[PDB]
Structure 1
Amino acid sequence: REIITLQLGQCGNQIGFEFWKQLCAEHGISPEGIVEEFTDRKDVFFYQYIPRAVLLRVIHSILNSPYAKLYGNNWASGFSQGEKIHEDIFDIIDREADGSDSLEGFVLCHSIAGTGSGLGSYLLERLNDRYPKKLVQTYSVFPVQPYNSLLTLKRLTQNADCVVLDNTALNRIATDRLHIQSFSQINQLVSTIMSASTTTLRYPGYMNNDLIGLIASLIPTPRLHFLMTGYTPLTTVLDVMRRLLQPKNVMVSNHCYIAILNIIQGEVDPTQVHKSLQRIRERKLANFIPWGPASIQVALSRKSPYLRVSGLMMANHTSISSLFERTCRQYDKLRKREDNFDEMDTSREIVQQLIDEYHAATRPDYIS
């Protein structure tokens, strides 16, 4: 199986370029795409080595960097221009998909705030229509700005089969424990999460060896497909498992979890893992849905020898609905302040359905 990544807009290319820089170093691959001398599965992302990337002004900064050997602001303008080059950009993907052994997914790195907002919404509709069996995971990044923010939200709630990273929680963590006061400094933090998000697809493990294994575990219902991240070390597994549940680390600005996935990338002791989960159940640090039986999953991994204990948390929290109300509320305030303008309210209608879908998920009778 393979995964082809797509990078749209200025935000996509940079956080994508920093994603490949971190991964090329994790593996024994020199910046000129030559293996250095100095067991890790590298066929999923690299093609025998060349990354399976599709980049879409900022391109010149990449071509002048030492990594050259490795390859408007209205949402309507972004959607329109994609319609004009439909066959052009779909000719580099078709060969990228066909030439692949057995395609599995389409990782998308973009921010919903201008062209990547529109051109991103356009490709998301074409992708599902062209292939219905291909997963589309999108590493969206949250910030006329309120309009374009919810328009893509309409497309992300029916097209994308699965991770939010909001800049507000990025700015707060930056000033708190990193002392930045800068785009080039926050990107070092997001790329650390991305390279850690797929740490179970670059190393042959016991379970979660496929992209559909990470997705179907968390997402119970195709509407509730928004996840958040947690990454503590910026020692036993109990210390890491407790620090991840602190809201000071969750990258999100009643309420309960639906399913949690913990990633431990260290050399920790494999028998004490059940002991930590036991004390979590006693102290009751996390609450879950009352309707369906939900559990917490923890998986170990092995760090690359060429490139200490870390930990990442992937969870499906109902509190993510709060972020949508902020985008939703700001829209109505702009709708009273200023061909048919009917595409917006349809988007406004469908996003409200998800919000009510979330608030009804935390009830003991969410079914029907």
Structure 2
Amino acid sequence: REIITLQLGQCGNQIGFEFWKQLCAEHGISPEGIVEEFTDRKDVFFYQYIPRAVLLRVIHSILNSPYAKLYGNNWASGFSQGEKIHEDIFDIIDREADGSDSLEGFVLCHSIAGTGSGLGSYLLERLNDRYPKKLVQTYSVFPVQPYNSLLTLKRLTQNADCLVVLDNTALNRIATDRLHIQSFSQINQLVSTIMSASTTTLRYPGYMNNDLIGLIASLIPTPRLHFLMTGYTPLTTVLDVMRRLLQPKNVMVSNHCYIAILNIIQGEVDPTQVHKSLQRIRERKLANFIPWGPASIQVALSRKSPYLRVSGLMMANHTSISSLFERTCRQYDKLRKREDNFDEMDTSREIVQQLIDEYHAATRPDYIS
């Protein structure tokens, strides 16, 4: 099962270009697409080695970079031009699909803040037409700006089978708090750390989680509550790492309860005190979950690349993600009272309200019905 990734807009290119650089080094692969001599499953993202990427003036910046041998501002402009090249970019994706053994997903990296917003809205619609059995995960990045942002949310709430939020605001704080930057060339270094460590269980096979649909169906219980946030502590036992992930200082997000937690421990820590920490987290009650359904916390170990110390990443499905929407929803109405049908915006307006209500209904002891 192979995962063909997409990169749209200046954001998607820059994070993806730095995502591949983090992966190319984590394996024994020279930037010349040649394996270095110097066990790790590398057939998911690389094709025997060439990465399975379909990019879409930053492109020239990549073609001049040493990695050259490895391959307007309106939302309407993005959706319009995307229709004019419907056959062009689908020729590439189709020829890249059948050449692969068995396609599994479409990890799409785009920012909802110019053309990446309108084009990505076009793709996520068109993929569900032709490919109805392919998961579509998206590493969307949060920042007329209120308009282009929410319009993509209309598509991301009914097409994308998963979504990982990464807002530049909360990232900029961690850029200022523990890195003291005051730049895009620095915050993306943290984004590339989150994207690479997200698929560490696919590239390093273990007891479980050997396929993308194994990481998805565990967290996302229902087709609607499909938004996830991340947590990465290393910026020492398993109890030291588990306690730091639950602190609000580490989450990349600016009653409320969790739905499902998955912990990624990339250390060489002994797997005997693992259950002891989970036992302790239950006692001190450092996190609460949904009251209606049985919600449990899962922890997964892996092995660090010898070619490159305990780290940790947490995939979270938290109801407090509804706050980020309200900030978008709020500024929209203000721009709606300040200035061929203008119905798509209002129709998108309604469905976002259905989503936020579903979150605030998820924290109720009677979320069923």
TM-score, length basis structure 2: 0.99
SS in 2 for 1:159: coil
Offset of residue 265 of structure 1? 0.2
Deviations 1:141-194 (A, max 9, x none): 000000000000000000000000000011000000001010000010000011
Shift of 1:220: 0.3
Distance in 1, Cα, partners of 2:204 & 2:171? 29
Provide the rounded CA distance (Å) in 2 between the counterparts of 1:59 and 1:103. Answer: 26
In the TM superposition, what is the alpha-carbon distance from 1:244 to its structure 2 partner?
0.3
Residue 8 of structure 1: CA displacement? 0.2
**Percent identical:** 100
- Report how far residue 108 of structure 1 moved: 0.3
What are the superposed Cα offsets for residues 58-98 of structure 1, whole Å, 9 maximum, x if unpaired?
00000000000000000000000000000000000001011
Cα drift, residue 312 of structure 1: 0.2
Once the two structures are superposed, residues 217-240 of structure 1 have per-residue CA deviations (whole angstroms, 9 ceiling, x without a partner) of: 000000000000000010000000
User: 2:65 & 2:284 partners in 1: Cα distance?
Assistant: 51
SS of the aligned residue for 2:358 comes to helix
SS at match of 1:292: coil
Match of 1:292 in 2: 293
Three-state SS of the structure 1 residue aligned to 2:5 is: strand
Looking at structure 2, the residues matched to 279 and 93 of structure 1 have their Cα atoms a distance apart, in angstroms, of 48
Alpha-carbon displacement from aligned partner over 1:252-273 (angstroms, at most 9, x marks no partner): 0000000000000000010000
Deviation of residue 3 (structure 1)? 0.2
Alpha-carbon distance, 1:204 to partner: 1.3
1:105: how far off?
0.2
Q: CA deviation at 1:29?
A: 0.3
Residue 202 of structure 1: how far off its partner (Å) = 0.2
Deviations 1:105-135 (A, max 9, x none): 0000000000000000000000011111100
CA distance in 2, matches of 1:70, 1:44: 16
Query: What's the CA shift for 1:55?
Result: 0.5
The CA deviation at 1:100 is: 0.4
Once residues 15 and 185 of structure 1 are traced to their aligned partners in structure 2, the CA distance between those partners, rounded to angstroms, is: 11
Structure 2 unaligned residues grouped into runs of 5+: none
Separation in 2 of the partners of 1:6 and 1:308?
32
Instruction: List per-residue Cα deviations over 1:23-43 (Å, max 9, x = no partner).
Output: 000000000000001000000
Question: How far apart in 2 are the matches of 1:282 and 1:346?
Answer: 46
For residues 327-359 of structure 1, the C-alpha deviation after alignment (integer angstroms, 9 at most, x for no partner) is: 000000000000111110000000000000000
Quick one: distance in 2 between partners of 1:272 and 1:206?
18
SS state at 1:360 partner: helix
Q: Partners of 1:304 and 1:241 in 2: how far apart?
A: 22
Residue equivalent to 1:319: 320
Query: What's the CA shift for 1:286?
Result: 0.4
* Cα distance in 1, alignment partners of residues 278 and 43 from structure 2: 34
Within 1, Cα distance between the matches of 2:237 and 2:305?
21
By how many angstroms is 1:304 displaced? 1.1
User: C-alpha displacement at 1:16, in angstroms?
Assistant: 0.2
**Deviation of 1:248 (Å):** 0.2
TM superposition outliers: structure 1 runs of 4+ over 4 Å:
none
Query: Following the alignment from structure 1 to structure 2, what is the Cα–Cα distance between the partners of residues 2 and 190?
Result: 23
Tell me how far apart the structure 2 counterparts of residues 158 and 129 of structure 1 sit (CA, whole Å).
13
Deviation at 1:325, TM superposition (A): 0.5
Distance in 1 between the 2:343 and 2:119 partners? 20
Distance in 2, matches of 1:248 and 1:303, equals: 25
- Aligned alpha-carbon RMSD (Å): 0.4
Q: Write out aligned runs for 1:63-74 (5 A).
A: 63-74=63-74
